[PDB]
Amino acid sequence: AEAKKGIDVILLYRVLKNEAKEAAWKMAFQTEHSNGKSRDADSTATKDGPIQNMAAIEYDFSATSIVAVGDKHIDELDDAFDNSELVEIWEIDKAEKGTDKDVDKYKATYFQGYVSSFSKTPNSEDALELEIEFAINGIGQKGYATLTTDQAEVVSYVFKDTVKVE
Amino acid sequence: AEAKKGIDVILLYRVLKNEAKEAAWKMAFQTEHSNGKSRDADSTATKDGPIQNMAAIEYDFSATSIVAVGDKHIDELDDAFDNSELVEIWEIDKAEKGTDKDVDKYKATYFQGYVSSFSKTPNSEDALELEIEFAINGIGQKGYATLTTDQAEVVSYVFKDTVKVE
Amino acid sequence: YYFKDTKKYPLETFKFIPTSAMFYDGLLLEDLIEGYTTLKVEGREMTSLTIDSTAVKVGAIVNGQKINTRSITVTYQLKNKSSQAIQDDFKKMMAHLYREEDVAIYFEDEPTTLYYGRYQSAESVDGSSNSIISSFTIFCSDPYKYGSQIVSTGVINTVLRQPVMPTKIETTVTKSGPMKIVKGSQSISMSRANFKSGDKVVIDFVVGKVFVNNLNRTRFLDLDSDFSNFKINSNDKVTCSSANLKIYYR
Amino acid sequence: MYYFKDTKKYPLETFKFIPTSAMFYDGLLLEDLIEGYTTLKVEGREMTSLTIDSTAVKVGAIVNGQKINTRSITVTYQLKNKSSQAIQDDFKKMMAHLYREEDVAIYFEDEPTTLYYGRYQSAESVDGSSNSIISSFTIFCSDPYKYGSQIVS
Amino acid sequence: DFVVGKVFVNNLNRTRFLDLDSDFSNFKINSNDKVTCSSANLKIYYRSVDL
């Protein structure tokens, strides 16, 4: 079988109030992100053995990227953090494709939440780095999502001849 | 599609009581600084899922530099810390420029706050470093700031001939 | 939440009604204030008792029993953007909640029950923010959970977990003479009364009076009748020979 | 608080910042009388509680009366000064202004058309080893109503 | 006068004129209500009460 690479999972964002004007955009130069879920297990001891009682779900979310020059979406995220508005998040997997009624769609998951951290540490010898954390309401939903052509490929050059370009 | 270098972020200071006498100056030999924001979220669990509530903003600020010889501004900061006076702070980014009405200005941010730390550890085989921490009042404001000509260029040397200087 | 694609969304979405909403005096608090939401409601599950006893050499002797009242706690969330409109929101909420007598309370997760209670007190409210979480308490002096109303003509055809007391029994006198309502080993008799044809005799149990043609005529009732012990159970028959009966109960 | 400024010299003058929840006590602002005084937050003027009397019976209780409780308002402040002698005079002035023998009119800034009746009741213990103090005092309003503008019909 | 509980006639106290079965402190006004008197001209002072 074949292992699954971690470079095939990307993230998309969109501010909630602009859901009728634009499609979700992709943040550039992503390095890693972490997604975790957990439940609190409460144990009660009886004469037969421990019995576990489970609690609600807690989400732990984080992201990391490199700030690019001329990118205006970081300003949108900063304004959303300042004014405390809702943000949508998509987690799209590029290694899975749909079969019957979703031919050009990938498996994904849908979240909404706020922004609760915004940090950056510029040093004298490295590149600028950005770290974001979220607080998520409710329970994430499952389905299939659409990726445009320019957000799913990498650009490279092709063969060229040895004559002057006209 | 170019990464943003961390060298193009600098800081400027000025004591509040001298706002009508001198312009903001630049600290010599800066190495790195940290700027972070956060909100504390209280989670309330219901029968449909967690509902998050947001709190006020908390600022974490620090800076590090190398002490120069014959610099009188360190004395100003030390006296401000001793007498508990307010300080103004600017965080100017050199890679962003304005187009229409801000022709020779850079994007920046403005803070006011006190000084809550002043440390230095002189050993026998390294240079002397200074670490400063701040406590910030209110909420930072955004705008466009002006950099003069000698605070944005680095000195070099030019080609010369082999004849005796007159 | 509901799953949505990355394309533009051209439809309109409405407000979310939580699982446990409260109708206070026939109105929904979510439809009055645009920043209100009910989070959770506690204290409406179990009831406690209060047993009186006296100590003796080998234990205690129980003589009386009582049922404690009920208190309901409601937690909400009020959110706004301006420091001035939140005061008007609080004023509206207090104008709606404050009442002088008992009212009817309905809950969304219990669509077949009825409650009685009124607003009692509230916790302290934080004064340094515009997103506020707090709670208030409702005092219920009647710890029963009622249900829909059933009208039956002398035969009970429902299931009851406990024997109940009917609210009232209307009759329509057909024959002329005395009246006697008979149940198993229990009876209510007016043996010294002469009723003509067509009298409306209403036996009211919540107040303790017998109404005849909209007049107080309790003087006809014998003193040996079971007026306070009359409780009906499932599959019980109430019959009278001089009139036709109607029974109201929950 | 403050507003954005450039990196050049500022030739104009800035006046004192008036907080949102300022209080007019007997027609005077405390920020005007004392130059170091500042009001931080006011709590306790939002929500109202009742009192119900009842006696126990076999199937619950019987309610025989209701009453409306009074109100207490707690205001947090900060007094700042540089000299040890002058802060005592500032406290003397503040206490001499706050002490009253009857009810007075109380106005708040975030509610421009509301009137309160109350009086100073008590104060919290202040720190005795510094020149910047944070504490609070309590106002006792014996009439738990909020009035409005007067109308003639 | 309602706050004090007396009836003044030409700056003199004449509260004794009221009937024993009249409503004095139970007189409450509501929106869109009409108050009429057949002998004098009325002026009403009131403040909106918000709890």
3-state secondary structure B44-87: EECCCCEEEEEEEEEEEEEEEEECCCCCCHHHHHHHHHHHCCCE
Contact call for D and A: 3+ CB–CB distances under 8 Å: no
What is the Cα–Cα distance from B50 to E29, expressed in whole angstroms?
47
Kindly determine whether residue B44 and residue C39, on different chains, have CB atoms separated by under 8 Å.
yes
Kindly determine whether residue B138 and residue D7, on different chains, have CB atoms separated by under 8 Å.
no
Kindly determine whether residue D61 and residue C141, on different chains, have CB atoms separated by under 8 Å.
yes
- B35 contacts in A (CB within 8 Å)? 119-121
Are C90 and D47 contacting, i.e. CB atoms less than 8 angstroms apart?
yes
Are B111 and B88 contacting, i.e. CB atoms less than 8 angstroms apart?
yes
Are A104 and A65 contacting, i.e. CB atoms less than 8 angstroms apart?
no
Closest partner residue to D2 among B24, B138, B142, by Cβ? B138
Are B93 and B155 contacting, i.e. CB atoms less than 8 angstroms apart?
no
- Cβ partners under 8 Å of residue D135, min gap 6: D76, D77, D123, D124, D125, D126, D127
Give me E42's structure tokens. 């009325």
C3 to chain E, any CB pair closer than 8 A? The answer is no
Are C93 and C104 contacting, i.e. CB atoms less than 8 angstroms apart?
no
- Cβ partners under 8 Å of residue C107, min gap 6: C20, C21, C22, C23, C41, C44, C113, C115
Write the single-letter amino acid at E41.
Answer: N
What is the Cα–Cα distance from A30 to E13, expressed in whole angstroms?
87
> Exposed/middle/buried for A14, CB within 10 Å: 0-12, 13-18, 19+?
buried
Kindly determine whether residue B35 and residue A119, on different chains, have CB atoms separated by under 8 Å.
yes
Kindly determine whether residue C87 and residue D52, on different chains, have CB atoms separated by under 8 Å.
no
What is the Cα–Cα distance from D38 to D79, expressed in whole angstroms?
7
Q: Give the HSE-up count for residue C93: Cα atoms under 13 Å, Cβ half-sphere.
A: 23
Under DSSP, the state recorded for D122 is E
Using DSSP bridges, classify how beta strands C27-28 and C22-24 pair: parallel, antiparallel or unpaired.
antiparallel
Burial per residue of B115-153, b for 16 or more beta-carbon CB atoms within 10 angstroms, e otherwise: beeeeeeeeeeeeebbebebebeeebeeebbebeeeeee
CA–chain centroid gap for C121, Å, is: 21
- Compare all CA atoms of chain E with the CA of C95 and give the residue at the minimum distance: E51
CA–chain centroid gap for C217, Å, is: 29
Kindly determine whether residue C8 and residue A112, on different chains, have CB atoms separated by under 8 Å.
no
C127 to chain D, any CB pair closer than 8 A? The answer is yes
Are B131 and B64 contacting, i.e. CB atoms less than 8 angstroms apart?
yes
B106 to chain D, any CB pair closer than 8 A? The answer is no
What is the Cα–Cα distance from A59 to C82, expressed in whole angstroms?
31
What is the Cα–Cα distance from C48 to C154, expressed in whole angstroms?
35
Kindly determine whether residue D151 and residue E47, on different chains, have CB atoms separated by under 8 Å.
yes
Kindly determine whether residue E47 and residue D150, on different chains, have CB atoms separated by under 8 Å.
yes
Q: At C146, give phi and psi (nearest 5°).
A: -80, -175
- Cβ partners under 8 Å of residue A145, min gap 6: A90, A92, A105, A106, A107, A108, C5, C6
Mutation for testing the C interface, residue in B39, B51, B58, B139 having most C CBs under 10 Å: B51
Are C31 and C109 contacting, i.e. CB atoms less than 8 angstroms apart?
no
What is the Cα–Cα distance from B150 to B157, expressed in whole angstroms?
16
Query: B101 — alpha (psi -120 to 50), left (phi > 0) or beta?
Result: alpha
Closest partner residue to C87 among D61, D63, D110, by Cβ? D110
Which string of DSSP letters, residue by residue, matches E3-40? TT---EETTEE-GGGS-TT--STT----TT-----SSS
Kindly determine whether residue B48 and residue C129, on different chains, have CB atoms separated by under 8 Å.
no
Q: How far is D148 from chain C (nearest CA, A)?
A: 13
Burial per residue of C104-119, b for 16 or more beta-carbon CB atoms within 10 angstroms, e otherwise: ebbbeeeeeebbbbbb
- C98 contacts in E (CB within 8 Å)? 51
Kindly determine whether residue B19 and residue D6, on different chains, have CB atoms separated by under 8 Å.
no
- Cβ partners under 8 Å of residue C52, min gap 6: C62, C63, C64, C65, C66
Closest partner residue to B47 among C19, C131, C133, by Cβ? C19
**A29: three-class secondary structure by DSSP:** coil
What is the torsional sign of CA B66, B69, B74, B79? Answer: positive
* C-alpha dist (Å) from residue C18 to B48, B50, C76, D82, E47: 8, 12, 11, 55, 38
What is the Cα–Cα distance from A47 to D2, expressed in whole angstroms?
66
Query: C207 — alpha (psi -120 to 50), left (phi > 0) or beta?
Result: alpha
Contact call for E and C: 3+ CB–CB distances under 8 Å: yes
For chain E positions 29-48, those within 8 Å of chain D (CB to CB) are: 43-48
Under DSSP, the state recorded for C231 is -
Write the single-letter amino acid at C174.
Answer: T
Write the single-letter amino acid at D92.
Answer: K
Kindly determine whether residue A110 and residue C3, on different chains, have CB atoms separated by under 8 Å.
yes
Q: How far is A76 from chain B (nearest CA, A)?
A: 14
Per the document, the length of chain E is: 51
Residue recorded with tokens 């219901």:
B46
Kindly determine whether residue B19 and residue D9, on different chains, have CB atoms separated by under 8 Å.
yes
Residue recorded with tokens 């050199």:
B94
* C-alpha dist (Å) from residue E16 to D89, E13, E20, E24: 56, 8, 9, 13
Residue recorded with tokens 């100056």:
B25
Using DSSP bridges, classify how beta strands C131-140 and C70-79 pair: parallel, antiparallel or unpaired.
antiparallel
- Cβ partners under 8 Å of residue C236, min gap 6: C156, C183, C184
What is the Cα–Cα distance from B101 to B144, expressed in whole angstroms?
10
Q: How far is E51 from chain C (nearest CA, A)?
A: 7
* C-alpha dist (Å) from residue A75 to A78, A84, A105, B47, D97: 5, 14, 30, 36, 49
**C128 closest CA partner among D16, D19, D118:** D19
Are E17 and E7 contacting, i.e. CB atoms less than 8 angstroms apart?
yes
What is the Cα–Cα distance from A120 to B37, expressed in whole angstroms?
9
What is the Cα–Cα distance from C16 to B49, expressed in whole angstroms?
13
What pairs with residue C182 in β-bridges?
C187, C239
In total, the C-beta contacts within 8 angstroms joining chain D to chain E are: 33
- Compare all CA atoms of chain C with the CA of A22 and give the residue at the minimum distance: C8
Q: Give the HSE-up count for residue C231: Cα atoms under 13 Å, Cβ half-sphere.
A: 7
Q: List chains touching C (3+ CB pairs under 8 A).
A: A, B, D, E
Are D108 and D83 contacting, i.e. CB atoms less than 8 angstroms apart?
no
Kindly determine whether residue A141 and residue C2, on different chains, have CB atoms separated by under 8 Å.
yes
Kindly determine whether residue A19 and residue C9, on different chains, have CB atoms separated by under 8 Å.
yes
What is the torsional sign of CA D92, D97, D102, D107? Answer: negative
CB atoms within 10 A of CB D98: 16
Are C29 and A42 contacting, i.e. CB atoms less than 8 angstroms apart?
no
**D86: three-class secondary structure by DSSP:** helix
Which string of DSSP letters, residue by residue, matches C35-84? TEEEEEEES-S---EEEEEEEETTEEEEEEEEE--EEEEEEEEEE-SSTT
Are D6 and B23 contacting, i.e. CB atoms less than 8 angstroms apart?
no
- E44 contacts in D (CB within 8 Å)? 152-153
Give me D32's structure tokens. 């005007």
Write the single-letter amino acid at B27.
Answer: M
H or E element, residue A82: helix A73-83
What pairs with residue D63 in β-bridges?
D54
What is the Cα–Cα distance from D132 to D77, expressed in whole angstroms?
11
Q: What is the CA radius of gyration of chain C?
A: 26
**C127 closest CA partner among D124, D136, D117, D40:** D40
Strand (E) positions, A4-128?
A: 9-15, 25-26, 30-45, 50-66, 87-97, 106-120
Are C95 and C166 contacting, i.e. CB atoms less than 8 angstroms apart?
no
Technique behind this structure? cryo-EM
E4 to chain D, any CB pair closer than 8 A? The answer is no
**E50 closest CA partner among D111, D72, C91:** C91
Q: What is the CA radius of gyration of chain E?
A: 13
Mutation for testing the D interface, residue in B10, B12, B13, B19 having most D CBs under 10 Å: B19
* C-alpha dist (Å) from residue A13 to A92, A119, C4, C47: 11, 18, 13, 49
For chain D positions 97-116, those within 8 Å of chain E (CB to CB) are: 114
Q: At B5, give phi and psi (nearest 5°).
A: -75, 150
Strand (E) positions, chain C?
A: 22-24, 27-28, 36-42, 49-56, 59-67, 70-79, 103-107, 110-122, 131-140, 150-152, 168-173, 177-183, 186-195, 201-204, 209-212, 215-216, 239-240, 243-249
Report H helices in chain D.
Answer: 30-33, 84-98
Are C139 and C71 contacting, i.e. CB atoms less than 8 angstroms apart?
yes
**C98 closest CA partner among C118, C126, C122:** C118
What is the Cα–Cα distance from A129 to A119, expressed in whole angstroms?
9
What is the Cα–Cα distance from D120 to B119, expressed in whole angstroms?
46
What is the torsional sign of CA D105, D108, D114, D116? Answer: negative
Using DSSP bridges, classify how beta strands D150-152 and C177-183 pair: parallel, antiparallel or unpaired.
unpaired
What is the Cα–Cα distance from C163 to C158, expressed in whole angstroms?
12
What is the Cα–Cα distance from D28 to D19, expressed in whole angstroms?
15
Are B3 and B26 contacting, i.e. CB atoms less than 8 angstroms apart?
no
**B9 closest CA partner among A70, B26, B99:** B26
CB atoms within 10 A of CB C235: 10
> Exposed/middle/buried for A111, CB within 10 Å: 0-12, 13-18, 19+?
buried
- Compare all CA atoms of chain D with the CA of C89 and give the residue at the minimum distance: D46
H or E element, residue C88: helix C85-97
Using DSSP bridges, classify how beta strands D132-141 and C27-28 pair: parallel, antiparallel or unpaired.
unpaired
What is the Cα–Cα distance from B110 to B91, expressed in whole angstroms?
7
Residue recorded with tokens 């989400």:
A59
Q: How far is B142 from chain C (nearest CA, A)?
A: 21
- Compare all CA atoms of chain E with the CA of C87 and give the residue at the minimum distance: E50
D152 to chain E, any CB pair closer than 8 A? The answer is yes
What is the Cα–Cα distance from E51 to E47, expressed in whole angstroms?
13
Give me C52's structure tokens. 């009186």
**C181 closest CA partner among C223, C242, C228, C222:** C242
**B43 closest CA partner among C90, A113, C9:** A113
Q: List chains touching B (3+ CB pairs under 8 A).
A: A, C, D
What is the Cα–Cα distance from C151 to C157, expressed in whole angstroms?
10
Are D17 and D1 contacting, i.e. CB atoms less than 8 angstroms apart?
yes
Q: At D94, give phi and psi (nearest 5°).
A: -65, -45
Contact call for E and D: 3+ CB–CB distances under 8 Å: yes
Structure resolution, Å: 3.4
> Exposed/middle/buried for C22, CB within 10 Å: 0-12, 13-18, 19+?
buried
Contact call for C and D: 3+ CB–CB distances under 8 Å: yes
Residue recorded with tokens 């002698």:
D85
- B146 contacts in D (CB within 8 Å)? 6-8
Residue recorded with tokens 């030019």:
B158
Give me B166's structure tokens. 């007159």
Q: How far is B141 from chain D (nearest CA, A)?
A: 6
